[PDB]
């Protein structure tokens, strides 16, 4: 459908529960069950547009990953139906 | 690395064990453990170039999927390191 806003909140020693891949756009390859990501509504196929309010279209994979690793246990994302 | 050729062989009522996504290229979003795909050497991040000898760059997702569903229990693929 249209856009999609969501907030993930995790445990202090656990993961958000999703994998991403980048081609050239960045999208969700996998979402673990019962993870903050699934419970939040993340779905394989979604594409990452913003992270904590920042757009990522111009950033490289390792960077995006770095931002997410440094976001503490809360995470605000914005995705768009990919495929 | 360079190319990568592989052959998957499955059970008669089981799956090959992998998911694919297409953007616009088609690549492996997930590979289940102990599946013909993993044991064959398929890796998340790989991109599908050919299926049973046919190139897919010009084919749509549902088609690619259809070809694989009709390939019986054996499957010959060719992938290239994606990301």
């Amino acid at each position: 459908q249209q856009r999609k806003v969501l907030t993930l909140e995790k445990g202090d020693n656990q993961t958000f529960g999703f994998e991403i891949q980048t081609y050239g756009v960045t999208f969700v390859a996998r979402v673990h069950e019962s993870s903050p990501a699934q419970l939040a509504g993340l779905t394989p196929g979604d594409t990452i547009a913003s992270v904590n309010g920042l757009n990522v279209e111009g950033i490289r994979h390792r960077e995006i990953v770095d931002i997410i690793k440094a976001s503490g246990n809360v995470l605000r994302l914005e995705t768009l139906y990919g495929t | 690395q360079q190319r990568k050729v592989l052959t998957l062989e499955k059970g008669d009522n089981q799956t090959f064990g992998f998911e694919i996504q297409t953007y616009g290229v088609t690549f492996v979003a997930r590979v289940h453990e102990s599946s013909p795909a993993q044991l064959a050497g398929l890796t998340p991040g790989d991109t599908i170039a050919s299926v049973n000898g046919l190139n897919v760059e010009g084919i749509r997702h549902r088609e690619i999927v259809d070809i694989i569903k009709a390939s019986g229990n054996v499957l010959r693929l060719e992938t290239l390191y994606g990301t």
């Binding site: 999703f18 994998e19 891949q21 996998r30 | 998340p44 991040g45 990301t83």
Partner: peptide
Amino acid sequence: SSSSL
């Protein structure tokens, strides 16, 4: 490459 998060 796929990254876990």
